[PDB]
Ligand SMILES: Nc1ccc(NC(=O)OCCCCO)cc1
């Protein structure tokens with residue numbers, strides 16, 4: 090019911106609307122809908138209106154750019170010149186960026202118009218989006234449920250239909266989990282495929298961090314593919330998959346360290362069944378699948394060190410630099426195991442998370458949180474296992490809508506493909522989405 | 528005089544010769560010429576001839592592979608199943624690799640036939656190729672002079688016309704310097720563009736590389752372009768440079784912490800002056816060129832930490848993991864400085880090294896060494912400055928033949944271009960070559 094980013098760019102080139110009109114309608118949707126959601130927490134409406142006029146001048150001057158005049162937002166952690174980058178920290182609430190980030194620079198060169206920035210948790214360290222500077226973002230499908238983490242403001246903006254395109258970052262599921270919670274499309278990209286420059290920790294110039302990636306978020310896979318081509322360091326190989334027949338799928342509905350809803354399991358099997366009916370082959374086990382239990386142990390270990398920048402708590406000896414090199418070897422080994430698995434399979438079908446969006450939690454300690462799995466208690470932090478494979482291995486993982494649970498909360502599919510095949514992930518997701526309409 | 532890898536592939540495809548004949552012709556050239564050179568130190572001739580026969584069964588099957596039946600060698604540090612990978616250590620002379628390295632695997636899938644492996648220094652830690660397992664590689668242009676360091680076997684084997692194609696590695700100039708010492712082509716690739724898998728330290732699986740890149744070595748720029756497209760993780764963007772008119776070049780012939788000799792300065796200026804004659808704009812300074820003295824200091828500090836795998840002497844403190852992360856931020860700061868410089872410039876023209884191939888030295892400590900620069904003595908290790916920019920900044924850098932000094936020792940130009948523009952570096956070098964002809 091809302092214009093996609095590509096449709097918007099065509100509507101401005103095609104003449105039925107101007108870049109200023111596209112920007113004032115987006116502002117109008119933001120103001121008419123954000124009240125109960127609280128997604129667009131930084132607003133730059135006057136500078137955006139001037140950018141739209143400049144875009145219409147380019148449109149008048151016969152200039153055509155793939156995203157020309159398209160209004161959009163970006164996650165609050167990405168630097169935009171003249172805007173605050175806080176990461177949810179009150180200490181950093183007044184840190185104003187003096188230059189655009191690389192991803193914003195690429196999208197602005199494609200002609201995009203940035204209206205503001207979307208909400209995040211403190212330090213981008215939660216699966217919900219709430220912080221002292223901006224407040225809390227509420228899921229648009231259920232205001233009592235969380236809207237996902239770090240990219241949750243982005244996903245709630247797309248789900249509420251305010252803007253057609255968004256961009257997030259993902260060190261522990263922050264593109265896929267919000268897209269899952271809010272039923273939108275999110276692409277965790279191949280590690281090192283998109284520059285993090287400008288995704289700086291506030292008041293620093295440190296943006297590069299292992300396991301972490303930045304990726305597009307939208308409501309259509311065509312929007313993800315185009316935003317990825319605009320933002321990637323180099324053009325990534327386009328997908329040659331025309332249809333689903335012959336596709337080899339490994340379907341994972343179980344994990345050795347966590348669990349999934351029965352609604353989540355049925356949804357993921359229905360996606361595999363719909364592709365099976367479209368000529369794909371679906372396996373449910375493989376001798377080549379790496380040890381998912383050892384994976385999440387290595388992953389959490391490396392994740393803790395990266396977030397602590399090596400510093401060690403409570404007088405513990407810090408991990409040595411020599412041991413950090415061995416951990417990178419452990420990761421590299423694990424990536425080779427996934428290359429062998431991806432010789433037999435084109436994609437992994439698995440949950441994004443074990444359950445749908447949980448009710449708002451004021452508890453910062455994940456060990457003190459809990460989840461309800463079919464009316465039973467499950468550990469909160471153990472759910473990181475579904476996220477760990479694509480993050481630790483570097484593989485791209487797509488989170489795409491599959492439907493909703495009995496309570497009307499969205500359930501998304503995760504599609505994991507081999508490294509550097511991001512366009513295959515998008516292409517397969519589009520075909521799955523069509524196969525479910527059958 | 529000798530055929531190139533592309534030319535060789537065409538002759539086999541056309542049927543001017545079979546793959547077995549091209550293989551036997553290469554074996555004969557090695558047996559006739561390697562005697563005084565000692566470049567092809569690991570020989571796999573019998574397995575290569577069976578592989579050549581298999582390639583002919585595929586020419587008869589009309590299979591299309593861009594390197595089918597093309598004989599070549601690889602640097603000894605790359606793994607080949609069944610062949611030793613010692614890195615010049617006597618203790619590792621019997622370490623037999625159990626699987627092909629990735630780069631070997633890619634070239635073989637393109638149809639290349641591997642005759643063997645070329646000589647290296649102990650631990651790849653010098654600008655000459657000499658080790659207890661295999662002996663020393665002598666420069667083909669002057670047997671009293673070193674053949675380049677760590678790829679000297681590769682460069683010398685191409686300079687002697689034994690094989691059309693090779694492949695090296697580079698952390699401190701080891702593609703560029705051997706190519707300069709022997710007057711062949713060598714592409715130092717953008718960091719993280721080609722996989723180091725199989726370039727393992729003997730008896731380990733540790734590619735372990737920061738600042739370390741693998742890239743092809745050949746006698747023609749088109750051979751490098753083909754080898755780069757076969758081996759890169761992802762197809763790199765092709766060059767759009769049709770000619771030299773409009774090319775912005777920044778020529779450096781001085782460096783705040785090192786020196787070059789006059790014959791070397793004269794060749795680099797001759798390449799720029801010939802690009803000027805073809806329509807390129809040349810500058811000899813820029814407000815955007817970062818501090819090369821700070822660069823070489825930080826590069827040396829990172830190089831040593833990387834080579835020591837984080838270990839420190841018993842009297843010194845090890846660099847902490849947190850300090851290592853800050854050093855990676857320092858590198859990212861330097862790379863962004865080169866981004867801005869490359870907004871004003873398409874390429875940098877500079878020396879590969881200050882001097883041509885020096886006489887064989889048996890002194891392992893670089894601090895106890897020194898070079899002769901136009902009759903004057905100069906410290907040996909300071910010459911790491913010319914190499915440091917592309918390795919620290921990660922940029923691609925090509926080393927291409929320009930001429931020779933008064934003793935007939937070749938001189939190469941280093942062409943540095945912005946990150947991910949490896950094909951632009953190849954393309955400019957090819958253009959410079961055709962400008963220095965007509
Ligand atoms: N254990 C844990 C789980 C989820 C997150 N959220 C996240 O994915 O961060 C994305 C921001 C990229 C740079 O941090 C963090 C930690």
Ligand SMILES: Nc1ccc(NC(=O)OCCCCO)cc1
Pocket residue numbers: 651652653654676677696697698699700701702739740830
């Ligand atoms: N300090 C210093 C250390 C090493 C070299 N050798 C070199 O040129 O690169 C080595 C290529 C191996 C890549 O794994 C020179 C100086």
